[PDB]
Amino acid sequence: RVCPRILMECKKDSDCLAECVCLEHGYCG
């Protein structure tokens, strides 16, 4: 659940770094 507070777009969870996942806004946590 280590996902620093950043607002970038994504398409799938594994899109961002660390353990971030793609939330409702289609953006990473």
Curated annotation (Swiss-Prot):
Annotated GO MF terms: serine-type endopeptidase inhibitor activity
Entry keywords, A to Z: Disulfide bond, Knottin, Protease inhibitor, Secreted, Serine protease inhibitor
Sites annotated Reactive bond: 5-6
First-listed, main subcellular location of the protein, grouped into a coarse class: secreted
Matches recorded under InterPro entries: Prot_inh_squash (IPR000737), Proteinase_amylase_inhib_sf (IPR011052)
One GO cellular component term noted in the UniProt record for this chain: extracellular region
Disulfide-bond pairs as recorded: 3-20, 10-22, 16-28
Intracellular or extracellular location(s): Secreted
UniProt-listed CDD domains: PlantTI
Disulfide bond found in the keyword field: yes
Free-text function comment from the UniProt entry: Inhibits trypsin.
Family membership noted in the UniProt record: Belongs to the protease inhibitor I7 (squash-type serine protease inhibitor) family.
Domain notes: The presence of a 'disulfide through disulfide knot' structurally defines this protein as a knottin.
Protein name: Trypsin inhibitor 1
Species in which this protein is naturally found: Cucurbita maxima
Lineage: Eukaryota, Viridiplantae, Streptophyta, Embryophyta, Tracheophyta
